[PDB]
Amino acid sequence: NKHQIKQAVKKLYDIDVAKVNTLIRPDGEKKAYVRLAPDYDALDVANKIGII
Amino acid sequence: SSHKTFRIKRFLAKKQKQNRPIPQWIRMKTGNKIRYNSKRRHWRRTKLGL
Amino acid sequence: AKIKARDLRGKKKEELLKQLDDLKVELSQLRVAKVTGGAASKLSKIRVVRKSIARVLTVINQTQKENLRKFYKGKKYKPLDLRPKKTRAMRRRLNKHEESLKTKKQQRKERLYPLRKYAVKA
RNA sequence: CGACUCUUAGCGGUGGAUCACUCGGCUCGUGCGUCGAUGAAGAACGCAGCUAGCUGCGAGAAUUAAUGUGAAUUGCAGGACACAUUGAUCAUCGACACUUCGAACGCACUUGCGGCCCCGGGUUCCUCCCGGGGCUACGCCUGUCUGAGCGUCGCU
RNA sequence: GAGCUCUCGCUGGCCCUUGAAAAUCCGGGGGAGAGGGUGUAAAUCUCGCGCCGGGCCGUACCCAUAUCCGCAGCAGGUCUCC
RNA sequence: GCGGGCCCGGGUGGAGCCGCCGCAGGUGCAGAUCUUGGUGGUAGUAGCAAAUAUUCAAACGAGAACUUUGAAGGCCGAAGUGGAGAAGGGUUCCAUGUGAACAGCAGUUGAACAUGGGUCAGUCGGUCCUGAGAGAUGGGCGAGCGCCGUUCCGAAGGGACGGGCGAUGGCCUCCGUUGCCCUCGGCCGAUCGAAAGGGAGUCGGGUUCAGAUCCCCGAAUCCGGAGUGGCGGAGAUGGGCGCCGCGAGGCGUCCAGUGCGGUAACGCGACCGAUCCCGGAGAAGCCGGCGGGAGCCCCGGGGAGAGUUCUCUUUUCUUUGUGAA
RNA sequence: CUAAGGCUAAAUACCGGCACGAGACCGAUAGUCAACAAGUACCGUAAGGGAAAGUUGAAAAGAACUUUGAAGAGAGAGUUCA
RNA sequence: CGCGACCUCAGAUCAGACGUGGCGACCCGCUGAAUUUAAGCAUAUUAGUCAGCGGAGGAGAAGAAACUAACCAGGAUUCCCUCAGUAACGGCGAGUGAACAGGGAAGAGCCCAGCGCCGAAUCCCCGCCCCGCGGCGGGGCGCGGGACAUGUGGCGUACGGAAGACCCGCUCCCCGGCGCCGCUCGUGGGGGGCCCAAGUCCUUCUGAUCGAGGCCCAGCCCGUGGACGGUGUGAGGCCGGUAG
Ligand SMILES: [Mg+2]
Ligand SMILES: [Mg+2]
Ligand SMILES: [Mg+2]
Ligand SMILES: [Mg+2]
Ligand SMILES: [Mg+2]
Ligand SMILES: [Mg+2]
Ligand SMILES: [Mg+2]
Ligand SMILES: [Mg+2]
Ligand SMILES: [Mg+2]
Ligand SMILES: [Mg+2]
Ligand SMILES: [Mg+2]
Ligand SMILES: [Mg+2]
Ligand SMILES: [Mg+2]
Ligand SMILES: [Mg+2]
Ligand SMILES: [Mg+2]
Ligand SMILES: [Mg+2]
Ligand SMILES: [Mg+2]
Ligand SMILES: [Mg+2]
Ligand SMILES: [Mg+2]
Ligand SMILES: [Mg+2]
Ligand SMILES: [Mg+2]
Ligand SMILES: [Mg+2]
């Protein structure tokens, strides 16, 4: 659920989430857009996790 | 139909994932008798009669 | 780097949980590396980490269930999962004490007229 | 001598007949003769570095543990292992684990709505809310508790 | 501008045809009860702001002389709006 | 050798085979509109003719009647060959590349093939309600799987307020929870049944190769919670009496105070209240006539951009606005 | 003989299941439909219907390289006893 | 006006258990036809068969005479041969059709109600202690509960039984654990794992021998091992196995 996704992201990446938008892809996998709070930057955490 | 249920969507997703062709490195195995997927499904014929 | 059950048998529960957490973090990082190209060496570690996680969880579960069945050893009523599971019909079978049970009439007959050993032509 | 047409022969085409091979069938016979509410048969969905099908497996998901054996798997890289080490693969398999439907069990089958307890986030039980854990089907036997009767009786 | 379409509102005609149920929301009749006692309280079908949350599923495209059904890119068939 | 057939020569072939004495059989094909598979004449033949129509130049490209670009000529002529949906389809959608096979010519093209990408919601719908109907329990039948029936041969509501007791928890002040006792209580059959019926609440601009009333920006709104009430405001600060003080005003006491205005329809930001009862909305057919509002069309002009100007035309063509709350 | 009460192994059957053995049986249009990714592909709304399809070589040693062609395709060369 | 027993009847997310479905070759209980034959067809036949329903196990069912016989009698049930295509049934047509005795395979008998005698002498559940507890038992300690006199248990059932009288000789069977020696017939019971003989000998063919010739006797060695399969053909001795 979106609450579970928000809590999991918060616990994993030590981030605060504004909102989460989810969808089911036409392959069986669930895709979620995690909106970050204005205090944190998505590019910085993306560099930290390794994706760029 | 753009108004599908969850079960139908999962079924369609599984069929779509199964529709892919056979990888090439399978042919290089020792005991291999397979040349093509032979189960490819097109959307014009064999209309998946759900 | 190999994880073996022999070392995990004696480790405390909290140490095993911490090791499981570390392995799960490593597996998540391996998945992130897998979806970002990565390398063959990185990709071959996914199975190793998955099997290490399986070993840690197997040790945890075996130790927990052994302790739990040690606790219930002696109690008349035990949890269903700890009861012996042979078959549906074999659990409905007699208790092995009633099969040996004999009525007073049967015991009287057997005691009074036991089967004897005999031979002929002499 | 022309072209076309007819017969025969050599060679070259279409086709896969015949023969020889066979990890497959058919028939007879021997021993054993075992499913399930501690959740059967069957079905669905997922699981491999590269993986469609078959086969195997169940979020511990191409297998975990233990035992036996003892140097591989292999289509390619990667490699764990020192193969003077419980030690790679295999076979056995007695420990653990075993998603969703399904006799299928809170109510219906949309994966939608609920109730009873405990813990954590929020609290400093405060009820909203969120997450996790255990329960909540029918019939029936023994026993317990709480009950009804202008049923049969006894005292006041 | 009897101009076309949509909408709102009056007024009539027809029935031996009289033209849906439930969820849900609201108003009214009563006063069982509460309040503090002379500066305060019980109440606000909450008057104006202020704080927190709203979970799950579908969402691409065709919708038809070529993405549907007729063995097919078949002169056939297939419910609507502008 | 009459014959059924057989023995040698040559070539190919690469792994088993035959004679004789007996035994046994799924043992001999020209037909059965026989079964399966393959191949001919027909035959390079019928045919590639329903719905007006194409032409020029350039580009890519080995290759152009069919691709793309520009120009010209046409058609569909707002009940369209336009723009969006429902059922159905299920990746056919988007980008890149190939031209093996398919698109009854071709193709540099495709809905073909191979790689990747793409569907973001409290407000849009399912989810809630019931309709026609379906279908459990109670009951009855049936050898039986089951069937009949949905109120009928039922001890059918496990809910609630007010009071009492008992217990725990939390500054056992104050409250919540649970258990018991008293009390109150009609419903009408569990349940399912509509993405076009009923059903509170979101719009404007921008944005992608492909998604946007869903993403971003900016403005709102509905429902639920709100304990310790976060605030203000309404219940609200009236009169009499006895004193003090020039007065404003201050003190003590008796009370009133669950609002106010208008003759009226009714109005004012609020303006105690239970079990119970009544009513309304939801909640209604078809057709005719008339009137109001909006969108579009029409006319007289101002601007802005523009085709014609060999003659005329203060010219003809396009645009000229503001969301919900 | 003593009904209207009850129990009991053995000699018996076994086209399903588990694990074995054998054959005067068939040898890929045969033998089970299925020797192979077979109750699979595919057909029908459904109950259901249901195939075709084995063989390079001892060893891939599976034709490097040169040349024409855009390529499919050829000409040389090479491997192998072939 | 309430309380206390009993009888009938409800509620449970009350404590602990049990049934549901699947397979179904063989088995048991029901239901149950028409093709077909009769050269037509209606009784018959197909046929207690297929189809349908329900219920188990490793087997099921049956089973120890309310029997067969009429003999100088036999003696539970099940299966084989024969009885026997017979007695009998049947538009006496087509057709259908057993049983007894005899020979075998196997062989095993028993228990209640009632009738009566024993102080319910009987059984289930919960607490504690000891043993083992992975097919939850045994003993003891509980004025701890319940069931039972609307009848539990002991003796005892058609072959007779019970109690006394007194004739005769005398006192081991079963259950639950603790361990132990013999490895218990395919000639070591079952399952699993690791192993145990002998040419790659000399020439010669071939792409490659497992081919051919020869080697103290068909030839060199083993043989209680000369089955089979693999290995570049056709291998007792190359390898796994084979015999023991
Ligand atoms: Mg079609
Ligand atoms: Mg007795
Ligand atoms: Mg769309
Ligand atoms: Mg067309
Ligand atoms: Mg022609
Ligand atoms: Mg026209
Ligand atoms: Mg259109
Ligand atoms: Mg496209
Ligand atoms: Mg073509
Ligand atoms: Mg409904
Ligand atoms: Mg065949
Ligand atoms: Mg006849
Ligand atoms: Mg006839
Ligand atoms: Mg006839
Ligand atoms: Mg009959
Ligand atoms: Mg019996
Ligand atoms: Mg007899
Ligand atoms: Mg005779
Ligand atoms: Mg008695
Ligand atoms: Mg061989
Ligand atoms: Mg050999
Ligand atoms: Mg040897």
Q: Does residue C60 contact residue C9 with C-beta atoms inside 8 Å?
A: no
Q: Does residue B27 contact residue B34 with C-beta atoms inside 8 Å?
A: yes
Query: Nearest 5°: phi and psi at A21?
Result: -115, 125
- Residues paired with residue A31 on neighbouring β-strands, in sequence order: A23
Residue C83 CA to residue C68 CA, distance in Å, equals: 12
Residue C18 CA to residue C25 CA, distance in Å, equals: 11
CA dihedral C62, C68, C74, C75 (to 10 degrees): -140
Q: Which helix (H) or strand (E) holds A34?
A: strand A30-36
- DSSP at A24: E
Enumerate residues 6+ apart whose C-beta is below 8 A from A28: B10, B13, B14, B17
* Tally of CA atoms within 13 A in the half-sphere of C89 that contains its CB: 0
Taking phi over 0 as left and psi of -120 to 50 as alpha, with beta for the rest, B47 belongs to: alpha
A24 in contact with chain B, both atoms CB, cutoff 8 A: yes
- DSSP at B12: H
**How many Å lie between the centroid of ligand 4 and the Cα of residue B43?**
19
Length in residues, chain C? 122
Distance B2 CA to F124 C1' (A): 13
- DSSP at A21: E
Q: Residue A7 corresponds to which amino acid? A: Q
Residue C7 CA to residue C55 CA, distance in Å, equals: 11
Enumerate residues 6+ apart whose C-beta is below 8 A from C55: C3, C4, C5, C8
Q: Does residue A36 contact residue A17 with C-beta atoms inside 8 Å?
A: yes
Q: Does residue C23 contact residue C53 with C-beta atoms inside 8 Å?
A: yes
**How many Å lie between the centroid of ligand 17 and the Cα of residue C120?**
31
B11-30 residues near strand D (Cβ < 7 Å) = 11, 13-14, 17-18, 20-23, 25-26, 28-30
- Classify residue B33 by burial, with Cβ atoms within 10 Å: 0-12, 13-18, 19+: exposed
Instruction: Give buried/exposed letters for B2-20 (b at 16+ CB in 10 A, else e).
Output: eeeeeeeeeebbeeeeeee
Residue C80 CA to residue C47 CA, distance in Å, equals: 34
Method used for this model? Answer: cryo-EM
Q: What is the resolution of this structure in A?
A: 2.8
Query: Nearest 5°: phi and psi at C61?
Result: -65, -40
Which structure tokens are listed for C120? 């002929």
